[PDB]
Amino acid sequence: RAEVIFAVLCGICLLLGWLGPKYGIMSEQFGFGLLLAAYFFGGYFTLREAVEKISKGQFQIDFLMLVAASGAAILGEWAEGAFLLFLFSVGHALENYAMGRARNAVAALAGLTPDEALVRRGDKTETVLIENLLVGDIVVVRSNERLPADGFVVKGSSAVNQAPITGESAPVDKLPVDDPEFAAANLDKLTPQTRVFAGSINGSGSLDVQVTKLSGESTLARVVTLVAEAQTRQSPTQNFTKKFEKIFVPCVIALAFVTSFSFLILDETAAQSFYRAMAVLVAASPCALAIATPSAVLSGVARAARGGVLIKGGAPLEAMGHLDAIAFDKTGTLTIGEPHLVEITPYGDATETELLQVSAAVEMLSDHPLAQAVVRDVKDRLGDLPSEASDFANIIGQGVSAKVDSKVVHIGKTALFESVAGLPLPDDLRGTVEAMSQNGRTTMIVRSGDRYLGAIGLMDTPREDARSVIAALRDLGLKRMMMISGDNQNVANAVAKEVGLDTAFGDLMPEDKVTKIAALKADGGVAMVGDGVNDAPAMANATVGIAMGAAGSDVALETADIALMADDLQTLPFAVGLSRKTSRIIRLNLWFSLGVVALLIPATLFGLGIGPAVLVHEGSTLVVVANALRLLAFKDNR
Ligand code: BEF
Ligand SMILES: [Mg+2]
């Protein structure tokens, strides 16, 4: 059920009703009945726009073209009224397929938070709605559940996936606060081992969480609100046309009456001064504009799709050229989103091969996220893997222990070796590791009996794509750029140097990304490129939101106005380039479409009739359509 086929039927009826009676075997009784159908199908939808708004509202172009057809039938019947209602009906349908809007992603966001929470009541645990949690309530979050509230940990220890908010999908170890009365009074001093957020996914261990924000004030409830209370962003060419229509219709109706009464002052017959009014009426119908403006959009959109960029409508395709600034998420946007082994630092008499073989011997038994990366990359660097360790056990929150070659091996955080029986950590190795941490490596220290073997460093490296695409976009004039990541500052700065972005912010919350975007939007067009929930508010508030089409959260793909379906960043230079040509093509088509009307209004006030009207309108429409079709040939020049 769609009305676009009425335009098709107007075509079939207009063509066969026009051709058959004159270049075929058809009665004018029948070909006129086809012209009647070409008015019926043309009129039935185009009518309602005017009827509906003019019942209480203001005048609009849909009034002009709809009565123009009636005039064409009443006076000098040429059935060009059909050419008008056909071309007006396609003028609607082509706009119909151009539209898109930002607020739509609500359906996914709700799934991130549970409806209910277990809450302690002395010797009982009750079930309550999150709407009914008071501050200072102790909720119970058990294994693999969604956390219901922003709070701090007060009982138990676990590994929590904070991906919806930090953008990092690696579990973060959480531990209980040492005094909850102090923490509740001094939330600003909450270590990130203890703070937790709603919509995080719990790990193996149950946690008691003391609530600190109400249901409506959690960081995720803010993400929901900011995505919903974002606006639509107007196409400038559309709103220019809105202005023009509102003034143009009451402008041309002046000529409608002045020329209607022209016989009273000038030597002309009354019925032909009425034909003068109908001529300037039906000439005024901007059939060129009604086709030119959407056809550039639909063409460029389909070209983008064949180039691997999904575009949600005309507005972002127009905005993408005029950008002064662009901002990038790190994790999963500029980086792939997974740790790689990047640094190896032997110690004492340990060789590099010994450090890697003991590391892989133990990490073959772990199920922490880093372990698979250690095994992958040791097998790549050495070509082969050692025998697995014995006696594997976790040291919860700090690392692991195992046994290799009859010697006890500990691997983990610097805090583990301060906490366990063996030789204390050397003061120089401590500093070498701290320098790896400052340079943005997640670091493990490896110790074997008497001997520290050394340390290894892993980092989520940037896409090879990235530095090339950044410099490219600078050449196209995007001299305002920054990175805004929820990941910690050392990883952000290290990847910023690797990618070549000089301003880089980590440890951001989603609202902080909206703040950096607002500081850019004030001074130009800004685009936001991202892959996760914590980016969706910035995507909605920015001038144009762009999601990684494959790594993207469904929230981001719904919210964004652009999706890079390849996860190829080199689509961005193409996307802005096509946008610019798309703006040029319609810019030129706009002044053709106006001139054909604005220059031939007086040519019909000079007495030209309906016969020239249809021909000129046909020529204008054909030229605008063909010029728009240039965009299908646009080239990547990659
Ligand atoms: F995923 Be982004 F780096 F916050
Ligand atoms: Mg991300």
| Cβ of residue 516 lying under 6 Å from some atom of ligand 1 | no
Q: Which residues surround ligand 2, an ion (CB under 5 A)?
A: 167, 329, 331-332, 531-532
Q: Which of 461, 485, 514 to mutate to test the pocket of ligand 1 (most atoms within 8 A of CB)?
A: 485
Decide: helix, strand or coil at residue 493: helix
DSSP string covering 58-105: ---HHHHHHHHHHHHHHSS--SHHHHHHHHHHHHHHHHHTT---SGGG
Spatial CB neighbours of 571, under 8 Å, sequence gap ≥ 6? 307, 308, 309, 564
Q: How far is CA 632 from each of CA 99, 160, 300, rounded to the nearest angstrom? A: 20, 48, 7
Residues 339/564, Cβ–Cβ less than 8 Å: no
The Å distance, Cα 536 to ligand 2 centre, comes to 10
Please list, in sequence order, all residues whose beta carbon lies within 8 angstroms of the beta carbon of residue 506, skipping any fewer than 6 positions away. 330, 485, 486, 487, 488, 489, 490, 491, 492, 493
Strand partners of residue 159: 173
What is the spatial distance between Cα 44 and Cα 544, in angstroms, rounded to a whole number? 37
Q: How far is 47 from 557, CA to CA, in rounded Å?
A: 37
Looking at this protein, which amino acid is placed at residue 190? L
Q: What's the rounded Cα separation, in Å, for the pair 193 and 160?
A: 10
The rounded distance, in Å, linking the Cα atoms of 458 and 436 is: 9
Distance (angstroms) between ligand 1 centre and the Cα of 546 equals 14
Name, in order, each residue with C-beta under 8 angstroms of 36's C-beta and a sequence gap of 6 or more: none
Q: Return the C-alpha torsion angle 334, 339, 345, 351, nearest 10.
A: -130
For a pocket test of ligand 1, which of 487, 508, 509, 533 has the largest count of ligand atoms closer than 8 A to its C-beta? 487
Residue to probe by mutation, ligand 1, list 330, 460, 501, 529, most atoms within 8 Å of CB: 330
CB-count exposure of residue 376 (10 Å: 0-12, 13-18, 19+):
middle
CB of residue 460 inside a 6 A radius of ligand 1? no
Q: Is 532 in the pocket of ligand 1 (CB under 6 A)?
A: yes
Distance of CA 307 to the CA centre of its chain: 17
Q: In this structure, what token pair is assigned to residue 326?
A: 């662009």
- Tokens coding 529: 């490129």
Return d(Cα 184, Cα 180) in angstroms, integer. 6
d(CA 559, CA 7): 33
**Ligand nearest 506 Cα, by number?**
1
Please tell me the distance between residue 487's alpha carbon and the centre of ligand 2 in angstroms. 9
Nearest alpha-carbon partner for 328 in 498, 119, 79? 498
| Half-sphere exposure in the Cβ direction for 418 (13 Å, CA) | 6
The residue written with tokens 């923490």 in the block is: 183
CA distance linking residue 432 with residue 434, whole number of Å: 5
Q: Is the CB of 485 under 6 A from ligand 1?
A: yes
Cβ(571)–Cβ(308) under 8 Å? yes
Q: Is the CB of 330 under 6 A from ligand 1?
A: yes
Contacts of 496 by beta carbon, 8 Å cutoff, 6+ apart: 483, 502, 503, 504
Who contacts 232 (Cβ-Cβ below 8 Å, separation ≥6)? 101, 102, 103, 315
Instruction: Output phi, psi for 399, to 5 deg.
Output: 160, -145
Q: Which is it for strands 207-211 and 138-141: parallel, antiparallel or unpaired? A: antiparallel
Sequence-distant (6+) residues with CB within 8 A of 12 are none
For residues 494-505, one letter each, b for 16 or more C-beta atoms within 10 angstroms of the residue's C-beta and e for the rest, the string is bbbebbebeebb
- What residues contact 590, with CB distance under 8 A and at least 6 apart? 237, 289, 292, 293
Ligand 1 mean position, distance from CA 535 (Å): 7
Q: Which atom of ligand 1 is nearest to the CA of 513?
A: 4
Atom of ligand 1 nearest to the CA of 532: 1
3-state helix, strand, coil in the chain (%, to 5): 55, 15, 30
Between CA 252 and CA 280 the distance in angstroms is 8
Query: Is residue 381 within 8 Å of 341, Cβ to Cβ?
Result: yes
CB 273 within 8 A of CB 265: no
Of 169, 331, 483, 508, best ligand 1 pocket probe by most atoms within 8 Å of the beta carbon:
331
Technique of determination: X-ray
| SS3 label, residue 511 | helix
**Exposure of 150 by Cβ count < 10 A (0-12 exposed, 13-18 middle, 19+ buried)?**
buried
Q: Does domain 313-336+462-567 have CATH number 1.10.10.60?
A: no
Report which of 444, 478, 447, 473 is spatially closest to residue 458, judged by C-alpha positions.
444
Kindly state if the Cβ of 332 falls inside 6 Å of ligand 1. yes
Ligand 2 mean position, distance from CA 230 (Å): 20
Single out the residue of 139, 166, 158 nearest to residue 150, CA to CA: 139
Q: Are 460 and 486 in contact (CB under 8 A)?
A: no
CA distance 597 to 391: 86
Q: How far apart are CA 27 and CA 45, in angstroms?
A: 28
Convert 412-477 into a string of H (helix), E (strand) and C (coil). Answer: ECHHHHCCCCCCCCCHHHHHHHHHHHHCCCEEEEEEECCEEEEEEEEECCECHHHHHHHHHHHHCC
Q: Does 513 contact ligand 1 (Cβ within 6 A)? A: no
Does ligand 1 come within 6 angstroms of the Cβ of 486?
yes
Nearest-atom index, ligand 1, CA of 534: 4
Amino acid letter, 593: S
Distance from Cα 393 to the centre of ligand 2, integer Å: 32
Of 150, 153, 155, 172, which Cα lies nearest the Cα of 163?
172
Q: Where do we find the tokens 């949600």?
A: 312
Residue 310 C-alpha to ligand 2 middle, in angstroms? 19
Token pair belonging to 264: 């009273």
Strand partners, 394: 400
* Rg over CA atoms, the chain: 34
Which of 62, 150, 208, 329 is labelled catalytic? 329
User: Quick check: is 329 catalytic?
Assistant: yes
Class of domain 340-458: alpha beta
Ligand 1 atom closest to Cα of 486? 4
Ligand 2 centroid from CA 200, angstroms: 15
Using DSSP's 3-state secondary structure scheme, residue 386 falls into coil
> Coil, strand or helix: which one is 537?
helix
* Ligand 1 atom at minimal distance to the Cα of residue 492: 3
- The four Cα atoms 278, 283, 287, 293 give a dihedral, to 10 degrees, of -130
Q: Among the atoms of ligand 1, which is closest to the Cα of residue 508?
A: 4
d(CA 234, CA 556): 21
Question: Which atom of ligand 1 is least distant from the CA of 168?
Answer: 1
Q: How many other C-beta atoms are found inside a 10 Å radius of the C-beta of residue 24?
A: 10
User: Does the beta carbon of 162 sit less than 6 angstroms from any atom of ligand 1?
Assistant: no
Choices 3.30.390.50, 3.40.50.720, 2.70.150.10, 3.40.190.10: CATH for 114-217: 2.70.150.10
First to last CA, the chain: 42
CA distance 336 to 390: 33
167 CA from centroid of ligand 2 (Å): 5
Ligand nearest the Cα atom of residue 487: 1
User: What gap in Å lies between CA 327 and CA 481, rounded to an integer?
Assistant: 6
DSSP 8-state secondary structure symbol assigned to residue 264: G
Q: What is the resolution of this structure in A?
A: 3.1
